[PDB]
């Protein structure tokens, strides 16, 4: 039986390659980055009517200036998000300044490869890599708003807008046409809610969809359900204006 380190005849680690398909099975995360802020949109995807849909969490604060979205097997991300708060917090303790986004992302990517069978004293703290991919959003004074996609591949790209999850293929087709550098914060919110509706498998309502932004002034804020209801009513209007 294969080990966990084995390469294929192509030169790809089996587990790391297989892991990418676990992300395809996850729920939809959309991220649009503008010059005024980044908007994070998620399909909560309740599984019953008895399931209370408010306790489900897919957006989490890392620090007042970094927020995170998850797609895939999301209990693995419990371990990744804990590392991140420590790196971000420990780094504000040693140098009296908030991490960059670009540096924080890279620390979680180093962590990702750690699978193995053990040798000497060296920690290998998984048997298979983190079965989850993350959209790290955030803002520093140096490079404005940024948006990153950190995959268990161990590589991260900075994106203008990426969408991962079940509807990744059809979602990113719509972004490629709709995005340009001149979106504001209130147009991106309606643009995420329009794309979230095309790839969604339910009815769009306030209970099973969540929005989040990141501005310098106010930090990282998750919208309550009340505010999201107004933006859902405001989508139906612009499509009947036409």
């Amino acid at each position: 039986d294969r080990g966990v380190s084995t390469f294929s005849p192509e030169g790809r680690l089996f587990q790391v390659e297989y892991s990418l398909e676990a992300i395809k099975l996850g729920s939809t995360a959309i991220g649009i980055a503008t010059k005024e802020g980044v908007v994070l949109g998620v399909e909560k995807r309740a599984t019953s009517p008895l399931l209370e849909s408010d306790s489900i969490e897919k957006i989490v604060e890392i620090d007042r200036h970094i927020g995170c979205a998850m797609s895939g097997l999301t209990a693995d991300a419990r371990s990744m998000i804990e590392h991140a708060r420590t790196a971000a917090v420990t780094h504000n303790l040693y140098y009296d300044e908030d991490i960059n986004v670009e540096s924080l992302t890279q620390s979680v990517c180093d962590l990702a490869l750690r699978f193995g069978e053990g040798a000497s004293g060296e920690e290998r703290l998984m048997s298979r890599p983190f079965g989850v991919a993350l959209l790290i959003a955030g803002h520093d004074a140096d490079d404005g708003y940024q948006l990153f996609h950190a995959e268990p591949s161990g590589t991260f790209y900075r994106y203008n807008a990426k969408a991962i999850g079940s509807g990744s293929e059809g979602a990113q087709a719509e972004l490629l046409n709709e995005w340009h550098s001149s979106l504001t914060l209130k147009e991106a919110e309606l643009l995420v809610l329009k794309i979230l509706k095309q790839v969604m498998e339910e009815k769009l309502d306030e209970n099973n969809a969540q929005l989040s932004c990141i501005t310098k002034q106010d930090g990282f804020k998750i919208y309550d359900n009340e505010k999201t209801a107004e933006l859902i009513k405001e989508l139906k209007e612009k499509e009947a204006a036409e």
Partner: protein, 212 residues
Amino acid sequence: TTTLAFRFQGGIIVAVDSRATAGNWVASQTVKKVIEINPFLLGTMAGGAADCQFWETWLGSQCRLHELREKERISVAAASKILSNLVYQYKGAGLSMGTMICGYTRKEGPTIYYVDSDGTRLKGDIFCVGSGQTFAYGVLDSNYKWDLSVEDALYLGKRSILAAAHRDAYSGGSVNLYHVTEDGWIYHGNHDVGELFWKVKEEEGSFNNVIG
């Protein structure tokens, strides 16, 4: 070094002096002895300056880590007992700790905890730490009321440091005031103790030993 904190109707007044010495030589006369742990907790530095400087910036880390995991502000009760467990592990290795962790949540009311390197964690209503602590106590016990105006309580705090800074050697320098309300601490400015003395002597008539 003379620092005091005392509960009252409107929250907590924290007043600290400023002078930091090494024997006869006065090292420096501007020492922010009050450490901003976070926007709702104040910690005072008394005794061994290093220990309290370092281990209460570390304490601000554990407050902001516990605020992200649970998503709620941290009790004053919990913040102090994170710190007594830290210095208890080190005990006898020779560190010196003497702090008041002061905060004001809705469920506890305004609270003070006084953490010591012995391992002591005391809840209290009036505290006073440092060499001049006995002088500050005298003025504070006679004029203290649970019901007191916010004007009169700022002015009572300022006078407790002045009474200590005059008699005791090491304290001196400058007074800082802080008013811990529900929204967090507001810094009430720095007062030089040399210019303050003639002001108090004038208004009240206090101080007659000194011809000045």
